[PDB]
Amino acid sequence: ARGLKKHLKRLNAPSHWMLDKLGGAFAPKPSSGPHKARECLPLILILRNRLKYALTYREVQSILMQRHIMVDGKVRTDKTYPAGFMDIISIPKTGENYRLLYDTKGRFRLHSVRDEDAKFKLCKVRSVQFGQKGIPYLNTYDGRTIRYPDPLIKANDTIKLDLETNKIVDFIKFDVGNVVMVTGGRNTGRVGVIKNREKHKGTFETIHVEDAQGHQFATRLGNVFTIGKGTKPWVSLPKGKGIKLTIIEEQRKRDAAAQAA
Amino acid sequence: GISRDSMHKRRATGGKQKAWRKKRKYELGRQPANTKLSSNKTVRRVRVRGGNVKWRALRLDTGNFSWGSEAVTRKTRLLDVVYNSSNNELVRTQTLVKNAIVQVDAAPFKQWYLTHSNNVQRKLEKRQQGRTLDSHIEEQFSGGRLLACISSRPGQCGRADGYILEGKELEFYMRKLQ
Amino acid sequence: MAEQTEKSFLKQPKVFLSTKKADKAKRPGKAGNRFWKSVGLGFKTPREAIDGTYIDKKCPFTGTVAIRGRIIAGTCHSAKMNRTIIVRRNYLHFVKKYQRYEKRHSNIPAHISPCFRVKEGDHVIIGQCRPLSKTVRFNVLKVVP
RNA sequence: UACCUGGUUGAUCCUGCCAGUAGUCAUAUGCUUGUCUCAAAGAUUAAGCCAUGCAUGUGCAAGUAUGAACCAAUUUGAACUGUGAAACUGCGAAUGGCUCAUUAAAUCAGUUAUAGUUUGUUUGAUGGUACGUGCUACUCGGAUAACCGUAGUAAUUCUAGAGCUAAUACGUGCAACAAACCCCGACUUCUGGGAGGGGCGCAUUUAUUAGAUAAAUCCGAUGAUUCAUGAUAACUCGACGGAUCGCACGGCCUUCGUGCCGGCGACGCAUCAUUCAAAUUUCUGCCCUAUCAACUUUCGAUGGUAGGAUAGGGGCCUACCAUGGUGGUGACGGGUGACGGAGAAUUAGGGUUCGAUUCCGGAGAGGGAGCCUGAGAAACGGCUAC
RNA sequence: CCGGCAUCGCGCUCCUAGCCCGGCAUCGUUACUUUGAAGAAAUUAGAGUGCUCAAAGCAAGCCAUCGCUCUGGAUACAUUAGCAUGGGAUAACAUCAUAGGA
RNA sequence: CCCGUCGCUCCUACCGAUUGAAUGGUCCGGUGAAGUGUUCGGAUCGCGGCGACGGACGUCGCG
RNA sequence: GGUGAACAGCCUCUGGCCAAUGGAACAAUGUAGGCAAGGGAAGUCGGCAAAACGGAUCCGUAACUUCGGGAAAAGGAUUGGCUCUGAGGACUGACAGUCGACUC
Ligand SMILES: [Mg+2]
Ligand SMILES: [Mg+2]
Ligand SMILES: [Mg+2]
Ligand SMILES: [Mg+2]
Ligand SMILES: [Mg+2]
Ligand SMILES: [Mg+2]
Ligand SMILES: [Mg+2]
Ligand SMILES: [Mg+2]
Ligand SMILES: [Mg+2]
Ligand SMILES: [Mg+2]
Ligand SMILES: [Mg+2]
Ligand SMILES: [Mg+2]
Ligand SMILES: [Mg+2]
Ligand SMILES: [Mg+2]
Ligand SMILES: [Mg+2]
Ligand SMILES: [Mg+2]
Ligand SMILES: [Mg+2]
Ligand SMILES: [Mg+2]
Ligand SMILES: [Mg+2]
Ligand SMILES: [Mg+2]
Ligand SMILES: [Mg+2]
Ligand SMILES: [Mg+2]
Numbered sequence A: 001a002r003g004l005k006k007h008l009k010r011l012n013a014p015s016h017w018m019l020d021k022l023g024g025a026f027a028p029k030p031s032s033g034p035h036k037a038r039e040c041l042p043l044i045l046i047l048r049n050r051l052k053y054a055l056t057y058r059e060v061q062s063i064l065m066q067r068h069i070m071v072d073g074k075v076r077t078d079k080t081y082p083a084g085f086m087d088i089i090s091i092p093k094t095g096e097n098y099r100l101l102y103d104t105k106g107r108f109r110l111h112s113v114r115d116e117d118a119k120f121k122l123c124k125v126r127s128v129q130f131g132q133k134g135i136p137y138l139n140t141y142d143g144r145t146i147r148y149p150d151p152l153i154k155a156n157d158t159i160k161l162d163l164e165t166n167k168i169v170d171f172i173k174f175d176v177g178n179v180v181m182v183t184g185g186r187n188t189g190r191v192g193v194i195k196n197r198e199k200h201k202g203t204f205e206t207i208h209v210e211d212a213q214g215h216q217f218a219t220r221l222g223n224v225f226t227i228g229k230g231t232k233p234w235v236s237l238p239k240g241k242g243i244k245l246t247i248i249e250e251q252r253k254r255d256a257a258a259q260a261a
Numbered sequence B: 001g002i003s004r005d006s007m008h009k010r011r012a013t014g015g016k017q018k019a020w021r022k023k024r025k026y027e028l029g030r031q032p033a034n035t036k037l038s039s040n041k042t043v044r045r046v047r048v049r050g051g052n053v054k055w056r057a058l059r060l061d062t063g064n065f066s067w068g069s070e071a072v073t074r075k076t077r078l079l080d081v082v083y084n085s086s087n088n089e090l091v092r093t094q095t096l097v098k099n100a101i102v103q104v105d106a107a108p109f110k111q112w113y114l115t116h117s118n119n120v121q122r123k124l125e126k127r128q129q130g131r132t133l134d135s136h137i138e139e140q141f142s143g144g145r146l147l148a149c150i151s152s153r154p155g156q157c158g159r160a161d162g163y164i165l166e167g168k169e170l171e172f173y174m175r176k177l178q
Numbered sequence C: 001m002a003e004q005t006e007k008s009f010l011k012q013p014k015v016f017l018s019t020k021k022a023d024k025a026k027r028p029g030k031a032g033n034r035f036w037k038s039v040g041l042g043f044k045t046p047r048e049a050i051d052g053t054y055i056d057k058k059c060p061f062t063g064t065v066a067i068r069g070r071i072i073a074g075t076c077h078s079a080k081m082n083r084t085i086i087v088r089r090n091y092l093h094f095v096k097k098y099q100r101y102e103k104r105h106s107n108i109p110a111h112i113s114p115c116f117r118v119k120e121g122d123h124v125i126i127g128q129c130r131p132l133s134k135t136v137r138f139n140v141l142k143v144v145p
Numbered sequence D: 001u002a003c004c005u006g007g008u009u010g011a012u013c014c015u016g017c018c019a020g021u022a023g024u025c026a027u028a029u030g031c032u033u034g035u036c037u038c039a040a041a042g043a044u045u046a047a048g049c050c051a052u053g054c055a056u057g058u059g060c061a062a063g064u065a066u067g068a069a070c071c072a073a074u075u076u077g078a079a080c081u082g083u084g085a086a087a088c089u090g091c092g093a094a095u096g097g098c099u100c101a102u103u104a105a106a107u108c109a110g111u112u113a114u115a116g117u118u119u120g121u122u123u124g125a126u127g128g129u130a131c132g133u134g135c136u137a138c139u140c141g142g143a144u145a146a147c148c149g150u151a152g153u154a155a156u157u158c159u160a161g162a163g164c165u166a167a168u169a170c171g172u173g174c175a176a177c178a179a180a181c182c183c184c185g186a187c188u189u190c191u192g193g194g195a196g197g198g199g200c201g202c203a204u205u206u207a208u209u210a211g212a213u214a215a216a217u218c219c220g221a222u223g224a225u226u227c228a229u230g231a232u233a234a235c236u237c238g239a240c241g242g243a244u245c246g247c248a249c250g251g252c253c254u255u256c257g258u259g260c261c262g263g264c265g266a267c268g269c270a271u272c273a274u275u276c277a278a279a280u281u282u283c284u285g286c287c288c289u290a291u292c293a294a295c296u297u298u299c300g301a302u303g304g305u306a307g308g309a310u311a312g313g314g315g316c317c318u319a320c321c322a323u324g325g326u327g328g329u330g331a332c333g334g335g336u337g338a339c340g341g342a343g344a345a346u347u348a349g350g351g352u353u354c355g356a357u358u359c360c361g362g363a364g365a366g367g368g369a370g371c372c373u374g375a376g377a378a379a380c381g382g383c384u385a386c
Numbered sequence E: 001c002c003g004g005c006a007u008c009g010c011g012c013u014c015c016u017a018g019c020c021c022g023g024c025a026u027c028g029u030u031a032c033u034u035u036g037a038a039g040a041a042a043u044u045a046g047a048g049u050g051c052u053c054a055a056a057g058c059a060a061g062c063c064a065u066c067g068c069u070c071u072g073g074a075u076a077c078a079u080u081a082g083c084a085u086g087g088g089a090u091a092a093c094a095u096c097a098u099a100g101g102a
Numbered sequence F: 001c002c003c004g005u006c007g008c009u010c011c012u013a014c015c016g017a018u019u020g021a022a023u024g025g026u027c028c029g030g031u032g033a034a035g036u037g038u039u040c041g042g043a044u045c046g047c048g049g050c051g052a053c054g055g056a057c058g059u060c061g062c063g
Numbered sequence G: 001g002g003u004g005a006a007c008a009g010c011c012u013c014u015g016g017c018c019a020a021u022g023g024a025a026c027a028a029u030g031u032a033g034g035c036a037a038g039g040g041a042a043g044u045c046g047g048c049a050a051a052a053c054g055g056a057u058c059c060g061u062a063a064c065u066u067c068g069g070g071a072a073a074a075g076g077a078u079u080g081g082c083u084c085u086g087a088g089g090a091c092u093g094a095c096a097g098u099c100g101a102c103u104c
Helices: A043-051 A057-065 A247-259 B088-093 B107-114 B118-126 B135-143 B167-177
Strands: A088-091 A096-103 A107-112 A120-130 A136-140 A145-147 A158-162 A168-172 A179-181 A191-198 A206-210 A216-220 A226-228 B035-037 B042-047 B053-060 B062-067 B072-084 B100-104 B146-150 B161-164 C071-081 C084-088 C093-095 C100-102 C107-111 C123-128 C138-144
Touching: A043 A057, A043 A107, A168 A226, B035 B072, B062 B100, B072 B088, B072 B107, B072 B167, B107 B135, B135 B146, B135 B167, B146 B167, C071 C107, C071 C138, C084 C123, C084 C138, C107 C123
Parallel strands: B035 B053, B062 B161, C107 C138
Antiparallel strands: A088 A096, A096 A107, A120 A136, A120 A158, A136 A145, A158 A168, A179 A191, A179 A226, A191 A206, A206 A216, B042 B053, B062 B072, B072 B100, B100 B146, B146 B161, C071 C084, C071 C123, C084 C107, C093 C100, C123 C138
16 A cells, blocks of 8 residues: 555464454554564563463553563563564563573464573574675674674574673574574474585575484575574473474373373 | 656557556656756755655756776866767757766866976886876867766766766767767 | 677776776776676576677676576577567466366567577577566576577 | 256157256345344445534653643742643654455466665664864854734635744754875985875765685685775765753762762664565466457557666666567457455365455545655645646 | 395596495486475364353363462365476477587 | 248337437547746845945845 | 749740820729628529638548549648758778769
């Protein structure tokens, strides 16, 4: 039409928001922000629909305008903020930290972390290039721009950032054999170790990953995300250690949980 | 207004295209500038998409011309338009337009060329053993005004910038000027 | 000289001919040497596009067009225009009601550089570029006769 | 539930249709109707016409207050203290919503591309020189609404004039080095220089140059670039480089002087990236019609070159040149009681028919056409004309 | 159902490259076929769930049903066009006889 | 059993002089509102330079 | 000779003429030529007479047809002056020199 669309209808909402169908006509319409806004969750979905600390739009407004809800080292009072992958959401009054990760079935969990693994975050880089006066800088998929990059940190790689020094402390070089976890598509959620990476001139680079227990799959580059060097992750995985389990297997889990009680 | 739409054209097969929209702004045009060469220098603001500004140069006399073979770029004053690769009428009515051929003062270039105690003549003798200075441009200095190719977009940026002719381009335009 | 044939002097942008300090081996496109660009994708820049005198701003190798998008193969259907051909993309179509194939086709205008030399009905490989004209969105990258 | 039944005959076996049979998230209507849950409803005809009323306005501690009010009420110094209605300023009104008229490779779907572009905002990073002969900043303008007052008009958020008073409205204008380097350049000693002093932010445009190899001291990206970016010479009557607003006070005297000072924010300028997007754009795909076989092209048709315009590619337009483009694989033309799609009904399978409609995309606001503001409109709950 | 082998396997220098050595680049196209990715939800199929059933909905269930636990909110389909991997049976195109061959 | 002409009633379509008629479109040409851009234009309105002149005047500064 | 498509009309050169009985006046009716407001064939047997159209370039051109035409159908646009630009040639030694009356 004749400008930006400022309403979002619940059915048009991303499928991983889980939100119901007769709940209304409209959805939170996540504001423009630092993350892709189709791969994100508004802090209203973080508060009302997952943690249930409120029960209405206006009560979530009270939550956020109290200045309690602090994201990534700094309080964000916007109620449609596109919080997404490894954004850390802290609450001083509850002294309670959360970190937003994919779970194996393609959705977002809020995994609790203690303070030491909440002092910092971890994100991949979009691309590193020069700027004014020849000073190099790199761009992350969180949008952050970092100047004077370590001369070895390259594109597609991963970098840890503290919230006080607010710069790089270490980086994982995206390469063969380091644990990744896909962040988009049908394979999203599953962690695994890269086992192969083939490139075709002029198209998306394909990443073949193997899970911790035998299964193998493939993914496009924009979706994969190294976590740690080697098999060991540098982040606390959720209750499913990044293994997507077949529906038969997950039926057996619930059957066994039934027959164990 | 003036429109850049592909709607009013035919199709590639040659059939008419029934209209389905009313004209949109983001397919507009604006009427050309026909930048004259005149003393009463006049460049007017136009406010375009994105809110930024373009400089419609209605008429200029003073331009900015480079000399690549010696890498010196001097302000100068335009003399006249003498050749224009699309239309003779544009030469006739003296419109400043990209890839046109104007004539320039040679005053900044002469006074530069005289440039380039013992510290001075030592540097002059270090140079001036490499002067080549083709006769085709030297005779043009002796005539007192140089051919130059305007390379800016005066209706787009509001300037008459350009470069002095040398070499095959000089000699080809020359061989058309007689 | 032959290639300068129009009412303007044809010349390659940002390439400066009559320079003082010139040398035959610095990099092409610099110090008076003709510009060319390896379009890539395994396509090899032709020898006469290297040592060619023609000046052509729509050539993939020597011009200002970048080959990006999708790549097609077709056949030269006619070479009756200036620096352009129409490639016919024969293929087959699936009629789902009938489980059979009907052959459809499409004529595609494609810009050739003067480096290439096409006769009617020559296998060609073309790649997508910026819109050069009303109908031309492709440049010829390979010609197999 | 992958189905048949009555009718040509004196009777028979057929081809064959007629009629029966069942559904419709498919409408109308007729008869009838006690309870619960659910919930389409001026689309088809008239994208015909509209009385009335509403549907888009906005206020924080943080742009502007003794102009007139309310609450505090004064040791009668200063506040306008605190609540602020009106108004200026800023922002939104380009979303929502309604409809399907026009439109049949067009919109639209899947899939690309932008290295061919603009993008208020978000988020993150970022920013010297304003003149002083680059030897540390150099000065503070009235008028304007609301108010008061005098009025025309029959008249409308019609309208002239006087008196007042602000700015984050408007308009000026202080500038943080070594200048790193770049070009001139007195004389010295001869210079390969010392050089004494004279010219140089960031954006805009133009131009030069660099942006590095291969087996017997080279350093970013791409699948692909003269890319990212640097240096240079300039260039602009330069948009810009903060005359803004909040609280909480609180270490310590240099002249003990609200004194040396100092943090946390709000707003705002510009650049890059991100995001919200847009706009173009590649391939393939759409119903019936040959009683629609040639259509396009002087006046843009297809292409080339140069330019103009656009935010940008492009015959989008101009000048010149070439003689091309589509078609029996159905162009062009005509019909459509035709917006496209996700999908709906029916279904053994395959299909047949439908899809105005609440989700996505497009298009319109009586019919056309043209523009202001703005980041965003060819807006119609904006204007101009017929 | 298949890995790898050898037989009368044109070579590979380079990443994947053995405890001299498997499984390495470029130097005919397609279709077909397998697998993979990306694939908007709503609709449909289909898993769980005693809205009392049911159409539905996406909830909700168990603690001593005392200051909280366990949560789910699956999965499929998506023909045609495009991208990518394995095969070469079947089927078209082009074509070693001038050798301008290796 | 049955074919056709003729006579009559009714329905439907056809040809048909009438430069037939109406509605709606499309093209060429004529006229052309209006807006946008442009040239001149200059109603008034801003340091109100200077005459060192008595709130005034002309030279007025350019915008 | 000029214009012009032109042995059209109009004007001039060589050659030839001012020969047609003259003076005054400008009344009616005439013969020949024009022009008229508004209307536009009502006039009259009848558009008789007059007016209108008229060259050229570009576009467009119906019914009917013996397929040759109708056709210069009908219906439109342009045309001056002056200053330019472009294209079309000849002779001589893909270029150079010399010349060139015209047409678009
Ligand atoms: Mg809308
Ligand atoms: Mg059946
Ligand atoms: Mg019978
Ligand atoms: Mg019977
Ligand atoms: Mg029936
Ligand atoms: Mg309708
Ligand atoms: Mg209406
Ligand atoms: Mg162009
Ligand atoms: Mg319709
Ligand atoms: Mg809609
Ligand atoms: Mg609209
Ligand atoms: Mg409108
Ligand atoms: Mg309305
Ligand atoms: Mg003549
Ligand atoms: Mg005659
Ligand atoms: Mg008359
Ligand atoms: Mg008569
Ligand atoms: Mg009569
Ligand atoms: Mg009579
Ligand atoms: Mg009569
Ligand atoms: Mg007559
Ligand atoms: Mg006739």
